[PDB]
Amino acid sequence: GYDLSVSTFSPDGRLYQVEYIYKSINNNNTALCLECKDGIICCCINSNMDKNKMIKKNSYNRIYHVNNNIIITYSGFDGDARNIIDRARSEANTYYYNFHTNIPLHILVNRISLYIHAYTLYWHMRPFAASIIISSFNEKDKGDIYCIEPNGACYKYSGIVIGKNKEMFKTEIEKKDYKDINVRDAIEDIYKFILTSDDHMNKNNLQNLVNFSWICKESSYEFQNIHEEILTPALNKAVEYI
Amino acid sequence: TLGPVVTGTSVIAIKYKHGIMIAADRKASYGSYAKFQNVERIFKINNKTVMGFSGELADAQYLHELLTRKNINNLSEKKRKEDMYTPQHYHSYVSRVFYVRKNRIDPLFNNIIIAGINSQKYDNNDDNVLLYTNEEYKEIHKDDLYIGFVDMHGTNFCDDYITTGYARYFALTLLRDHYKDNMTEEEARILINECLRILYFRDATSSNFIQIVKVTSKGVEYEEPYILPC
Amino acid sequence: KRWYPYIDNGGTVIGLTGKDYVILAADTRLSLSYSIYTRFCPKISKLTDKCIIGSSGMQSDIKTLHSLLQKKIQLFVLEHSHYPDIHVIARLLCVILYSRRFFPYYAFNILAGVDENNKGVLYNYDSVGSYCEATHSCVGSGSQLILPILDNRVEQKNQLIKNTNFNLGDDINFVKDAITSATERDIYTGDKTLIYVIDKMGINVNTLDLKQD
Amino acid sequence: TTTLAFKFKDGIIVAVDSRASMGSFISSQNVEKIIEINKNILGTMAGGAADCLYWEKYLGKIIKIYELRNNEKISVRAASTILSNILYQYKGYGLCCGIILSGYDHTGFNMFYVDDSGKKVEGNLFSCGSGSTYAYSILDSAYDYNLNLDQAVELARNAIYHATFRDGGSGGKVRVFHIHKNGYDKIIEGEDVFDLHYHYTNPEQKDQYVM
Amino acid sequence: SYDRAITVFSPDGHLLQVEHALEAVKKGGCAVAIKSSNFAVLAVEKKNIPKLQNPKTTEKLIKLDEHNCLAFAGLNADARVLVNKTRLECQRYYLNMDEPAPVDYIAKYVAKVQQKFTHRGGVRPFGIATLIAGFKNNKEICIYQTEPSGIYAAWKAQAIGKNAKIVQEFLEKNYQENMEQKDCIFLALKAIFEVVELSSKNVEVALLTEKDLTFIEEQEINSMVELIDQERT
Amino acid sequence: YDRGVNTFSPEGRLFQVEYALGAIKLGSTAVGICVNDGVILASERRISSTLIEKDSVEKLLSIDDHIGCAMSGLMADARTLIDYARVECNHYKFIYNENINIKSCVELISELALDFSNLSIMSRPFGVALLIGGVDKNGPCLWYTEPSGTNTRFSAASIGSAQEGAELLLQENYKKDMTFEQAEILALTVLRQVMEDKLSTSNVEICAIKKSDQTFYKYNTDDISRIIDVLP
Amino acid sequence: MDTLIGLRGNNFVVLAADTYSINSIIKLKNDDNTKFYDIHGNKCLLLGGSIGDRLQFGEFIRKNVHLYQYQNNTDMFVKSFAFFTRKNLAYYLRRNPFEVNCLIAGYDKKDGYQLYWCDYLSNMDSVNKGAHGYGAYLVSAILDKYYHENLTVDEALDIFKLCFEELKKRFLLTQINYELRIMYDNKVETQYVTV
Amino acid sequence: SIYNYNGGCVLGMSGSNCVAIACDLRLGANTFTTVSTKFSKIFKMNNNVYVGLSGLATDIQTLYEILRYRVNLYEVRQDAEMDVECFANMLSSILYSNRFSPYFVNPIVVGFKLKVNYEPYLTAYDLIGAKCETRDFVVNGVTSEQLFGMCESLYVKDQDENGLFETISQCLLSALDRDCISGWGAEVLVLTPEKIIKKKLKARMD
Amino acid sequence: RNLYDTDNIIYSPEGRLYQVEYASEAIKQGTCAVAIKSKDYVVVSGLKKCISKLSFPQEKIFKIDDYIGISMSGITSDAKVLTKFMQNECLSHKFLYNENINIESLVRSVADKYQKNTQKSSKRAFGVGLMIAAYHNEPCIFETRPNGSYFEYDALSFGARSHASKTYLEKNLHLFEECSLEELILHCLKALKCSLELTISNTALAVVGKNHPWQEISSLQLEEYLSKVK
Numbered sequence A: 001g002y003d004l005s006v007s008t009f010s011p012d013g014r015l016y017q018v019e020y021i022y023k024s025i026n027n028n029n030t031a032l033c034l035e036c037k038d039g040i041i042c043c044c045i046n047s048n049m050d051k052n053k054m055i056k057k058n059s060y061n062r063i064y065h066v067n068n069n070i071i072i073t074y075s076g077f078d079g080d081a082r083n084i085i086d087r088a089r090s091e092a093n094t095y096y097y098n099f100h101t102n103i104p105l106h107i108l109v110n111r112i113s114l115y116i117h118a119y120t121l122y123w124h125m126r127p128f129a130a131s132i133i134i135s136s137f138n139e140k141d142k143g144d145i146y147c148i149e150p151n152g153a154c155y156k157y158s159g160i161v162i163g164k165n166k167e168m169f170k171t172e173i174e175k176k177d178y179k180d181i182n183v184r185d186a187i188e189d190i191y192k193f194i195l196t197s198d199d200h201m202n203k204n205n206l207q208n209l210v211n212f213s214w215i216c217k218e219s220s221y222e223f224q225n226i227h228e229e230i231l232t233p234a235l236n237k238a239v240e241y242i
Numbered sequence B: 001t002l003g004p005v006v007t008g009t010s011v012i013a014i015k016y017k018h019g020i021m022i023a024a025d026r027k028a029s030y031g032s033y034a035k036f037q038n039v040e041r042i043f044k045i046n047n048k049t050v051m052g053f054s055g056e057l058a059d060a061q062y063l064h065e066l067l068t069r070k071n072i073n074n075l076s077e078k079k080r081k082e083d084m085y086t087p088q089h090y091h092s093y094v095s096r097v098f099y100v101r102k103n104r105i106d107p108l109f110n111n112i113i114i115a116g117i118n119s120q121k122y123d124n125n126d127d128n129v130l131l132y133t134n135e136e137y138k139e140i141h142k143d144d145l146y147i148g149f150v151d152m153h154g155t156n157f158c159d160d161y162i163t164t165g166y167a168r169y170f171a172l173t174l175l176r177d178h179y180k181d182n183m184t185e186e187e188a189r190i191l192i193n194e195c196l197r198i199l200y201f202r203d204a205t206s207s208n209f210i211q212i213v214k215v216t217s218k219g220v221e222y223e224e225p226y227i228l229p230c
Numbered sequence C: 001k002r003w004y005p006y007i008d009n010g011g012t013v014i015g016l017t018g019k020d021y022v023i024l025a026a027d028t029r030l031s032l033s034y035s036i037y038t039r040f041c042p043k044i045s046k047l048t049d050k051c052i053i054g055s056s057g058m059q060s061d062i063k064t065l066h067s068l069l070q071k072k073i074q075l076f077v078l079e080h081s082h083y084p085d086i087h088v089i090a091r092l093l094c095v096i097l098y099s100r101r102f103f104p105y106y107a108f109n110i111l112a113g114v115d116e117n118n119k120g121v122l123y124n125y126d127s128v129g130s131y132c133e134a135t136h137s138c139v140g141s142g143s144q145l146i147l148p149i150l151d152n153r154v155e156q157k158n159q160l161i162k163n164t165n166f167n168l169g170d171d172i173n174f175v176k177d178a179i180t181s182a183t184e185r186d187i188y189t190g191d192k193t194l195i196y197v198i199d200k201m202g203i204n205v206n207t208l209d210l211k212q213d
Numbered sequence D: 001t002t003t004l005a006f007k008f009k010d011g012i013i014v015a016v017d018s019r020a021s022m023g024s025f026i027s028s029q030n031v032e033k034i035i036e037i038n039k040n041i042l043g044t045m046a047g048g049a050a051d052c053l054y055w056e057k058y059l060g061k062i063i064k065i066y067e068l069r070n071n072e073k074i075s076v077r078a079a080s081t082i083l084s085n086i087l088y089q090y091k092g093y094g095l096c097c098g099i100i101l102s103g104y105d106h107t108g109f110n111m112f113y114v115d116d117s118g119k120k121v122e123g124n125l126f127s128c129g130s131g132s133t134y135a136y137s138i139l140d141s142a143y144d145y146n147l148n149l150d151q152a153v154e155l156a157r158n159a160i161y162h163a164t165f166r167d168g169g170s171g172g173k174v175r176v177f178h179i180h181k182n183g184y185d186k187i188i189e190g191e192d193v194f195d196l197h198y199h200y201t202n203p204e205q206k207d208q209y210v211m
Numbered sequence E: 001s002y003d004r005a006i007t008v009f010s011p012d013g014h015l016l017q018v019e020h021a022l023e024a025v026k027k028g029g030c031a032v033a034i035k036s037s038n039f040a041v042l043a044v045e046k047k048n049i050p051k052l053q054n055p056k057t058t059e060k061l062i063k064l065d066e067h068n069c070l071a072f073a074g075l076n077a078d079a080r081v082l083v084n085k086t087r088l089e090c091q092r093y094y095l096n097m098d099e100p101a102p103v104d105y106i107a108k109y110v111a112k113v114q115q116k117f118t119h120r121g122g123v124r125p126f127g128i129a130t131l132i133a134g135f136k137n138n139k140e141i142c143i144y145q146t147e148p149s150g151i152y153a154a155w156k157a158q159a160i161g162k163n164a165k166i167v168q169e170f171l172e173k174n175y176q177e178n179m180e181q182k183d184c185i186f187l188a189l190k191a192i193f194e195v196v197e198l199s200s201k202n203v204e205v206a207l208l209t210e211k212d213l214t215f216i217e218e219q220e221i222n223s224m225v226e227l228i229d230q231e232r233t
Numbered sequence F: 001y002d003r004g005v006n007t008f009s010p011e012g013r014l015f016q017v018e019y020a021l022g023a024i025k026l027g028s029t030a031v032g033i034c035v036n037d038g039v040i041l042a043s044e045r046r047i048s049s050t051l052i053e054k055d056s057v058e059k060l061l062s063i064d065d066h067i068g069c070a071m072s073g074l075m076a077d078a079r080t081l082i083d084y085a086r087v088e089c090n091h092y093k094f095i096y097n098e099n100i101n102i103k104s105c106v107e108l109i110s111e112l113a114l115d116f117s118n119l120s121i122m123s124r125p126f127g128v129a130l131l132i133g134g135v136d137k138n139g140p141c142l143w144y145t146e147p148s149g150t151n152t153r154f155s156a157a158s159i160g161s162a163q164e165g166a167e168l169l170l171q172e173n174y175k176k177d178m179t180f181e182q183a184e185i186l187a188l189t190v191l192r193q194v195m196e197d198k199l200s201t202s203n204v205e206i207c208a209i210k211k212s213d214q215t216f217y218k219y220n221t222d223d224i225s226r227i228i229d230v231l232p
Numbered sequence G: 001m002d003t004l005i006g007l008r009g010n011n012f013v014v015l016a017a018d019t020y021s022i023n024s025i026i027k028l029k030n031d032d033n034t035k036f037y038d039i040h041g042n043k044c045l046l047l048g049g050s051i052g053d054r055l056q057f058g059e060f061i062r063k064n065v066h067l068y069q070y071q072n073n074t075d076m077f078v079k080s081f082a083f084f085t086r087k088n089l090a091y092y093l094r095r096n097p098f099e100v101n102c103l104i105a106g107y108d109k110k111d112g113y114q115l116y117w118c119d120y121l122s123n124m125d126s127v128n129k130g131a132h133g134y135g136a137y138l139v140s141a142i143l144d145k146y147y148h149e150n151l152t153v154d155e156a157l158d159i160f161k162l163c164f165e166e167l168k169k170r171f172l173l174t175q176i177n178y179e180l181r182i183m184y185d186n187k188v189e190t191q192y193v194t195v
Numbered sequence H: 001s002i003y004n005y006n007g008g009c010v011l012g013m014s015g016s017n018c019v020a021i022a023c024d025l026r027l028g029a030n031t032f033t034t035v036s037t038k039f040s041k042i043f044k045m046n047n048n049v050y051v052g053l054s055g056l057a058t059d060i061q062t063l064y065e066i067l068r069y070r071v072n073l074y075e076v077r078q079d080a081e082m083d084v085e086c087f088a089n090m091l092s093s094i095l096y097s098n099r100f101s102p103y104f105v106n107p108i109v110v111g112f113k114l115k116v117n118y119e120p121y122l123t124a125y126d127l128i129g130a131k132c133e134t135r136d137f138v139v140n141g142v143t144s145e146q147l148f149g150m151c152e153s154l155y156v157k158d159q160d161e162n163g164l165f166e167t168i169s170q171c172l173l174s175a176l177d178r179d180c181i182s183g184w185g186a187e188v189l190v191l192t193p194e195k196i197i198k199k200k201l202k203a204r205m206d
Numbered sequence I: 001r002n003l004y005d006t007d008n009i010i011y012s013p014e015g016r017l018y019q020v021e022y023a024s025e026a027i028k029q030g031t032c033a034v035a036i037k038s039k040d041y042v043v044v045s046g047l048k049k050c051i052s053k054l055s056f057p058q059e060k061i062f063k064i065d066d067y068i069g070i071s072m073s074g075i076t077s078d079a080k081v082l083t084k085f086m087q088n089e090c091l092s093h094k095f096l097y098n099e100n101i102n103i104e105s106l107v108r109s110v111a112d113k114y115q116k117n118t119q120k121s122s123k124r125a126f127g128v129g130l131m132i133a134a135y136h137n138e139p140c141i142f143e144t145r146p147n148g149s150y151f152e153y154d155a156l157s158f159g160a161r162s163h164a165s166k167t168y169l170e171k172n173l174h175l176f177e178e179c180s181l182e183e184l185i186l187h188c189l190k191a192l193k194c195s196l197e198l199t200i201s202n203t204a205l206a207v208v209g210k211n212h213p214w215q216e217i218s219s220l221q222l223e224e225y226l227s228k229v230k
């Protein structure tokens, strides 16, 4: 009876609706961000759409950006995450209007965390069902990656995975330190981890179900999606390895 | 803004064979006081769009901030280079802003030039845009180039060349006499320098310290500012 | 000083009906005080394939009003599944103009068209939305010059010997003579004129150069 | 502008000129200054043509809704009250209307004068516009309740003629409508008052008439 | 329930709140209205505690405006607030039109308000039925009966309230179109006394003409009650 | 009780509109027939008492001069809808100086219905079925609207208690080419078959909008007497 | 321009006004009926000033008092009526003023016959006699001279005849036609006096 | 000039175990036409609290109605008479609540403060509630200068009821005889802790 | 699941929103619609619902803009609301600016409108699925859903018995890119016919593409195409 409203604590001091949101997110499509020596690399594996064959090639992209220098991705429902990303862009716009400089990453993360958290307080609002990764990289400060949970918790990482099969992806990513590995070498490792972890993914759908993006030295520390010419030899080498 | 206090003087924009050439002296006057003499009055909107102003500096800076966030929001939603807003889109947006503020009796005391390149079929600068970091010029048809004027009352139009402020009398006479299609960079520079020379001699709010900006196939290039030769 | 929000950008729009056609000729000069912004700024906007609107006054108000009327006509077409004739568009324009009765559009308008019965129609409008049908009209800076000319040619009230048999070609040439006289005597009228002819086959545009001084 | 209306033995006569001007310039001579509010009520225009036209059309809309709801023809009194309240609500915003609403209802023939200032005056004889005093003088000189329809129409035509002759704001064509128990008739749809001067005042046409 | 929908559709398609309002009407005192050529008679049951309750205070026959009057059956306080709203609308019409409110307009407005209260969030339906007697714009007299649902209809003779059906079938077999005044009050009194106890203190009867609404003095009611006692034996 | 007004069923149907569709089944039977000469709407008036003023209850109404309508279900809700339709049709006439299309009037009526959904104020569905007949620039036509918000153009249609038998008879006997007089005969014969009465004057209500004046005409005793004498 | 006159004795109150409807320089009517507003229950509001403001305020007060009397099923007292009228006039004074001058007359059993003078600024007081308009300047002293407490109604009407004759003789607007309300002996009577 | 429309003046004076308030009775119109000669500007709030309102007559009536409303609510809520100082502070707050659209009134408050000891209490106001308490006398109205002169010359400390009546009446009448737009009768109230004497003076009618 | 399907803001223990799922379930009862495209064109076809013998077919496809149309499946009133919203957005973009609205921006705005009704307990999801066909620099087919998601397709179909149409599209997808317009119309009509005969009355059919505004195919041309299919 206590699990029918986000605004009610259960006798053991838990909000069951947020836990059910966590269960919803853990079944959704995988997303990961990884700090590297020269950049951050973001990768979204949309394994759920392996059934739908008529979807346009690479149309579905869960990787978005703010200010052309902050990557923002998610695992969860598309509409809620679009709402959060619109809030992030609004916060960046308001900050630049007030102060004439771009929003710091930690301030944006805190504000979006509060925005997510506010919907877990009242009996009439649906809490957002999405975990949100927000990340950036700079020449001086290196990489900063944050993950905002559906409960409003925000935590900083060197690398993070959310969504389906995140345990296996985390286990494979943890095998080696990536802060002394470049992003171009890291793409092959990400493809190998996807082939070993997600059972729906295979050689014939890696090219059209996976979104890639990064912020590194080669992109002048600004947002970009990986071109096909860089992706194709990497996934070919991963398939040959596997 | 009840009226102007810190004012920028004329701006002159023309089409030439490789794109748009837009010029303005770097002076902002506090009435008869030439208080500021190294001010920027030509703003980059995007890689194929620039904005220039004559009149009050505060209103122009407010408009520049508006167009900056409009460009950033455009970039956030972009997936291909054709999704980038054109100079005529920004001209329509600025005209609407001026029109609504005119209806509120709260005008921006400015005359605005919005200039640039309408077509994406000349370069791939918008495929990978860089906001925080900067071969021969391609010949561009004048139909693919855009220069547009807006005033305080929202009267908006476009032409092959546009002038604001005192340039509407001094520079524009020489432009209407001597302008021709498909001018080279040298000819456009010479014509603009002649116009700015006449303005320097006859406009008391004018300076001989010029800023030139070129919108070409290789994007927006801010030339090093110079004193008028001779 | 308070900022005055109205400016007259000048130029003429002349309209003349036939039995089954209507001519609307507008000059293209755009001016401020004694200076010229540009020599080509069309004053006539297409609304439907048998209806156009020309206006004279403040160019920003004219452009916004024409775009607004076009937007509402497209909305009408999508919602009610038929193109409105000139009388429907005329009442719509009257309501739109009166909706800003206390801060009017700074524009005098002529709505020209061919109705469902293949009859040429002109409606003339002041700023606040008072309007009426006419067989000939003129608005803009040179209207006081041209309205007597149109009165003398069309109605011939003060002529015992009346030649009231007109065709489309003579009407076009007479409208050209009228806009030429307006260019001669009105400083704000000149450069070029766009002449729209609406008849059974639809709308046809033609150009005539005028004096540029 | 000159409008007039008067009640008589066979109903109501309404009459108007057709001039519209912008200061000194005559913008039109074909203006329709009598509006069919409904099948039995006519309304005149004097002053602001925009306000008169718009609010008389609005009154027609309200009357149509009232008649459709109640299955009944509205009275002239109620229409005049609605118009006067609507015009009074915009007091101080510069509306300029002088309107004579005349018609037939279940309480007989009725006539009301209403202007922008909330005025609402019941009577049997009214005139509005810049030439109103001249039409008043002619009508009051010659008005009788037992005039026949032809006599009443001729009197209205003569009053409008003299108003247009004296007043620079009035001219063009005279229209004379007749409201009866079963609608209204346009007795004089439009008659150029150029002819009326050389009928009444200068029939000989051998010299300029000296006022 | 600031804006919660209180009236909603049941699985069979009924609006149960309106039915419960009708049940509240069925508990109320009986009222009867009868039409004639140029007048109407309205009679209402009244129950008061003898020797303790002031009989003047409870008015179930009410003058709405210059020329219209109202009887009701159901919750008294709901009747009071709706009657005051109707009086306000009567004077609003007479302000906006400069002619008194016709009876058909008033009945339509009362029906509209009742329907609105069946169809707005956060408001209960009015638990009353009403009989509105009055004059049309053409001076024809009419009686309009309205229900809690907002349905209305005009009637030659009608009854509302408790045991209204028996009074209805009586009036069907005894209404005789145009009638003199005395027989009209007599018909109203016997019709309401079919269901109501036969005493003069248990009824209030009034007559509506063009000029005013006049309440019949108790002596006439006593005499007619004695006559009704006589005819029943 | 427990489900809000906006609750979806497991089949993807709103509970309240499904329940409101039971209300339209109740009421008096009406028929509409559209032919090239015009549209006719006929209706039965189940008069409960002899003391009721017969003309006071109206089953056929005029939304406009060129639009007639027959209502079924909850009559107060129906009168609310028709009043809104009258106001918006007069608003269209004022704004555009022409008679509104029948489809546009039907569409705005069905937009007022389902206003309780609050997608962008009424609290519940209306529980009303309307047959809206009229004559516009595209000739005569007849539309049917219901609490779900769906509009459906019909050559011939029925509403009310005897909707099933009325539509069966109309399906059997309707032809696209029949004349106005045959359409009146068909309407009154269908009403005769579905009624439990002898079909006299002041027992049915008839209205029509023709393509000669495009004006709503409410019939009188002579017209029903004529058509009844013409009936076989 | 609208001359209003009022005179109160122990057994009556009398109000009077010119019957002219003015529009710029022309008399629309010589039998105007937009000044007197008779209220149910022995009450009268005689209004001056602009015709539109007169109509709006007079009908507003009339419809409010009638609503009161039908809602409560009693006749409002004359004092309550007068102070309600003053309160409503003063409420609009600082928001869209009604430029109307008022004489408020009535009869009560509680307070007998009553007259209240009230101007466009809502400055009100009970008076035995009062006047409004420019013509007030030419009639008030006559009301001061010939008034006494025990006047009969006919003597009061003779005083009003003196006032009307002086308004004809001396006032710039030669006002000839007058209407009169006579409240006395529980009846309200209308009279029309020419010259 | 708004105060010249009706004219009017109010005065108050203190004695030993007694206080007095007084006012003229004119209601004028357009500064020169007398329209009433019984328009009393003194109002009883309670037995120990009186207020004299001079200025525009509509604002006098409106403010008196507001003050009566507030005082009656206070007294029925507390079941006791309002203190004169509490009333004076309340009048200040009411006048200041309309600071930018003030009631064109210049009140005085005259009464007894209760301590049973009955201390005289007098205070004068401006239109926005700026109040000055005095031990001797208070004046407001268009005749303020003449009243100030008369009271300065003639005021005698700690007079009995009769002497207070004569002094305040002579002050008011002499001040009114030099003012065009005030006069036409004079009301004088003399309060003592057991009773009130209301008198109407045989005043000029010019 | 009866506990958790009562209000639209409640997640089930499996992390499911049952009311949004029921709004999606409303879409499968609509009549079938199909949309395919080539390099140049998008062809939309649909089965018009006919509820009785004397009825006329329910309209299935609607024009949004000169190069934008839609088809709907589900509750038609919700579809009407979304249609009016889309038409107003298109005309507002054509009013403020002088260009056609970006199709991706329009679809995102519609999806935001979908999602905003899923957040509050006083609102319900739109119980309708839209397929949006347009030509904005290329043929494009989008789909919207009650949960505020949207997708882009090379070929799309949904409604009652749309599984057979989906199977036909799965088989024949590789042909559509190089198909001409006539072959594309034939393929779309065959895919629709797999869901079932078709008739000029009961078959909505429209085309949009390069140099080709949105146009319903006329009854005579539709008769020719239906004859060719049979």
Ligand SMILES: O=C(NCc1nc(-c2ccc(C(F)(F)F)cc2)cs1)[C@H]1CCCN(C(=O)CO[C@H]2CCCNC2)C1
Residues within 6 Å of the ligand: C008, C056, C057, C058, C106, C107, C108, C124, C125, C126, C130, C131, C132, C137, C138, C139, C140, C141, C143, C144, D020, D022, D025, D026, D027, D028, D030, D031, D032, D049, D050
């Ligand atoms: O009368 C003129 N033409 C014919 C027209 N008749 C009308 C008209 C006439 C009668 C009625 C009604 F009563 F029957 F309803 C309604 C409308 C409007 S126009 C011109 C005469 C000189 C002034 N003029 C100009 O256009 C001057 O330029 C303006 C442009 C914008 C503002 N600044 C100056 C109009």
